[PDB]
Amino acid sequence: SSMSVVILAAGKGTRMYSDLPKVLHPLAGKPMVQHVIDAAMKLGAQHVHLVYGHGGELLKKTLNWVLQAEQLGTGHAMQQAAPHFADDEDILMLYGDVPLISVDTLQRLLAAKPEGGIGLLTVKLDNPSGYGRIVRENGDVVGIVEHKDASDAQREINEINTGILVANGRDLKRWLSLLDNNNAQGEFYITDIIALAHADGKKIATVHPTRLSEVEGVNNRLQLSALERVFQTEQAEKLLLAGVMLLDPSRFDLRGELTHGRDITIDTNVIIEGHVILGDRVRIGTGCVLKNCVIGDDSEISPYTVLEDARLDANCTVGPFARLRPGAELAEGAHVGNFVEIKKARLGKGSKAGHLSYLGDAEIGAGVNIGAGTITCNYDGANKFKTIIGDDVFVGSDTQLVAPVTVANGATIGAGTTVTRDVAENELVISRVKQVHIQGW
Amino acid sequence: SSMSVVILAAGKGTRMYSDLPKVLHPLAGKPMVQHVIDAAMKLGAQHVHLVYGHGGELLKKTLNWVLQAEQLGTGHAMQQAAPHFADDEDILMLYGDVPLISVDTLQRLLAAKPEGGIGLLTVKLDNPSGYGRIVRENGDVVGIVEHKDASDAQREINEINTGILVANGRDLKRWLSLLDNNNAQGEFYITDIIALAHADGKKIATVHPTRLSEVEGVNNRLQLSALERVFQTEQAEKLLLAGVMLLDPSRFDLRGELTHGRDITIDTNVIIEGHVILGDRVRIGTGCVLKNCVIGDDSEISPYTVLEDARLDANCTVGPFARLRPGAELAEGAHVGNFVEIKKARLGKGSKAGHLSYLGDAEIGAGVNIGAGTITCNYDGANKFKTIIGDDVFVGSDTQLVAPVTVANGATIGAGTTVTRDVAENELVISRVKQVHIQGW
Amino acid sequence: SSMSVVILAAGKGTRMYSDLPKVLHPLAGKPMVQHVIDAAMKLGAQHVHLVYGHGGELLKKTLNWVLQAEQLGTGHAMQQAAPHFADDEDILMLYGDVPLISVDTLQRLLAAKPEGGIGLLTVKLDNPSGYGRIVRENGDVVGIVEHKDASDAQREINEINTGILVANGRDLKRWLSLLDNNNAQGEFYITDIIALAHADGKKIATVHPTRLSEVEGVNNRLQLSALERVFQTEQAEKLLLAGVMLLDPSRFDLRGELTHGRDITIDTNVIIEGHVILGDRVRIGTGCVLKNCVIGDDSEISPYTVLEDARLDANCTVGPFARLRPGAELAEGAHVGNFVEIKKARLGKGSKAGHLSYLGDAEIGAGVNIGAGTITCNYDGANKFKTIIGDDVFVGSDTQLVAPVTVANGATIGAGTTVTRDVAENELVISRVKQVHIQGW
């Protein structure tokens, strides 16, 4: 049948000690709640109903919005969404702070819901302390008892409520209408709806997650960090099984997506962010950070190199200690060495910038040698200007190129030159500065 | 009552293979024995009696000193300290190589000591092999039997001696006087004092540590490394619960103290040393090392940045690959980029040094742009001299400023300039060097 | 008796997803199969028979070669090697993808082989699923039953076949000749030889490895990564017990050999490759990579320093963010600072290159100060040339030395100089460039 989702995002995240709404805190670079939304979309949800208390502005700025003005609990929260439920759709209840719930588990949950009844996700814990206990009579679920209100006998129950469940909209709206708030907490308890479904003589079927981490909620940053490590380990293991050699999968982080070829080797402490594409036989040395980059076949990134919005073609070498900024592009066989920064600049085929250089806003040809210490002066304090270097140019060490300026093919620039005017094809330019020599200084 | 501590620091650390006395080997940046002293001071010890064998010079240089001339054992060691005990104080016995003993455990130990008797810290191990066994008769402690001298029946005992205990000074001095040395080892066994206390009809009460790591001793560097990881994990978890987001708490080290604000994010492989203070919303990228630094609100430290004795005001950005040395100071909104080293220099509000620069012994104003490749020549081979740069100065790329020299407000320095004489307000200075152009080179 | 080894290297490594033969994939910097060969040589093998299917070219290029033209299984594989066995030697069967098998285990295996019979290495697993089961009758091994062909009763057996075994050559050749291929797989099963040995009334003795990891095979990169971590942890623990202080042994990698002195400290995330030699009291900061280097007593390598084929004498300091390339050599007390690259260059006693410099193909004397920004121009686009700097030379900041060129003892080079001609003893050389000053720019 058809289905929509309600994501509860309206708890108080006091133990996060944060000014950022709890469900916005990221896991693997993505807000927790977005993990949950992604899963919902994968399930084929027709609507996603997001219930919130505060941070509504930032929530909408970041990500069907449903206000819960007073933090009066989950039952009350659902009461707020209930009018938006279709009588003819299934409604899946999820939490914005339970980010690792898997599509497989949810699919099995939807499959297990008995006609007219409820599908309830439960899990058996070694220590169920503090959790809602699943109450069964002769094997069938009839009730949930919260820890606080549970008796000593009930507290021996190990099967507990994850709070994730599915029911038909018409049925759900009915059960929510029958909730009672007259009690020691002054709130409606969502958990009472399973007893209410039972009262109507309807069935509550259960399924279990595959992993405990799937139904773990985040209330503080220690708990978020554990889930971060679980998720990173999962990603790392998939990459290994898919043929990427991670030299230490416990020291690898992916925060986005990695599209990869064959026989790649990634060394320790590499961080991949955004969407990165790696060709065949790429090697990434220790400590590198890549964000939104494309790296061509057989390229080698040496240790402690940082790249963002950069492109390497095949057979390129970069680093160690290089810094590629957005718009940095290396054509086939180009080389960028240590203590070199490239920004919005292209280095043509086989061209080399091996040391202690800044190349910004530059179009550099093929077969070019950029000597150590070369710098493009691309900024006048108001605007930025382009440097153009042709093919087969030799730029001597510690030269400044003062943009806008063009150096034609075949030219040679002497060490220590300040280039302010265009250089013609096959021209040598060199500073003829006079020195004083003083004997016996 | 009143209390003093005896710390035993006189064992042979042969399996450390070190020229540094064993108890001086650090854990989280602090000698093991100093952890123990700190705990003692927290307990309110009136005196700390440190018993040593060798390395006394270095020990005192590093940290009431009590010689044990001949390594004749713990009983003998205590005999050496006994004359310093007051008849009217409690004496707590600790070890310099058991660094994680907690104040809580010790407080409970002091509370459990029966009048006229002994408080003894014991622990139950899955494998008690090699440890002193606690001998009980009808539930009461009467004895300790060392493993070697224990029978097969005794060796089944899992409750073992940690060697940590407390007794009144007068009582202790008596029991120590009654120790016998005529045996297969020629030494007095400290453990005999519990049997001696029993002989006098006094009670020996026991308490247990909360964690096994609290009473683990260090005899080799493998054991020290395990304790280092335990301690770092504890620190990391406290920081997470306190609201600091560590993106991987297994790749975080604190060796000193971290004072922090709210909504801080620290990425993998960060090392914090000395005392570091972080404002709200500070972000620290992967690989950074901070030692004795103050970082203001909303500052961002990019990957692979090293800072020591440095100060950032609010909204500053530094790195990646920047190196801030002692006396480096950034005013609000300042920026230091890649391959820049700052030493005993201040960069004023909104001023920028983005690349490949060395700024030492310099006072730099607000609104200054330091071009790539700029270097302060602060050294003449004997002394060091200051560079002063006013507000709203534009320093062109690859300039050297030869100190002492002053550049006034509003000035502009052309690329490639060697500045040796003061520059006046709103002055442009630029090198007019002649070049040779040779066609067809 | 005398002994030879057969290493099976002819499986299909489909789940590696690699163009490199599976047994060539490295563990700790060394092909898996080379670990196995090393063990064989340590055992005193007279011959090593390597059976292969494909990748024979690359295998021989990388490492008695024995073709198995058709991947028809292990029995068939051994049939191919059998003619090379001496009737009067023991033959040990190993696998190229089981890299951590220990010499101790193998020695015990060889010792346990009964005259005329077989020594078989087996292991007891918590989950034996998918493994060959060891079949015993009244305690004696008579059979091996592969999982697939095993009954439900047989599958309860926890003792499984590692496939590692030893038998006399004459005996082995006989048993291999009697293998039957007429079955649902069309292959000879090596495991049948133990039933065949039993048929002849010979004994099959068993021994067990000390660690499970010793007999773990690699079929995919996830499995290789687990073995990599096991191996690195073993190496790290040995180094700690031997007296090297690793500040985090889970963040330490050795890919080769480390020869070390006393009281060394290595911080987190250090990678040692090739053969590295460290003197006493060397400290290595976080993030460093050392490959084929010799570091003298009391030297300190600061964070994020990369060295290859480099030599430091005693009391040297390098980094942070320094890059030493092959042929880099520092004499006693020399210093290389941040953003400095040294290649095929020697820095003499007490000489300093603290910042933003490139020194290549250079002989630099003692007592030299290399100012920030100094660069050797060692390349003309075709060849490379040497720079020679004498003792007690002061090179001013941002100087280029244009090789070949010699600077004699005692000389001083002014900031910003382009040195193209030899400098005489005690000479000051300095650029006298004229500037334009424009007021009110």
Ligand SMILES: N[C@H]1[C@@H](OP(=O)(O)O)O[C@H](CO)[C@@H](O)[C@@H]1O
């Ligand atoms: N300094 C030059 C030298 O580098 P090194 O000798 O350090 O490799 O030659 C390289 C090519 O071989 C050039 O690209 C560098 O500009």
Ligand SMILES: N[C@H]1[C@@H](OP(=O)(O)O)O[C@H](CO)[C@@H](O)[C@@H]1O
């Ligand atoms: N090279 C200049 C350029 O940097 P980039 O263009 O690399 O950011 O402009 C920056 C301000 O926008 C200046 O501080 C840098 O000195």
Ligand SMILES: N[C@H]1[C@@H](OP(=O)(O)O)O[C@H](CO)[C@@H](O)[C@@H]1O
């Ligand atoms: N810039 C100089 C300064 O460095 P710093 O003042 O940054 O240590 O003096 C050092 C010696 O003291 C010299 O080697 C450096 O060349």
Ligand SMILES: [Mg+2]
């Ligand atoms: Mg210059």
Ligand SMILES: [Mg+2]
């Ligand atoms: Mg320069």
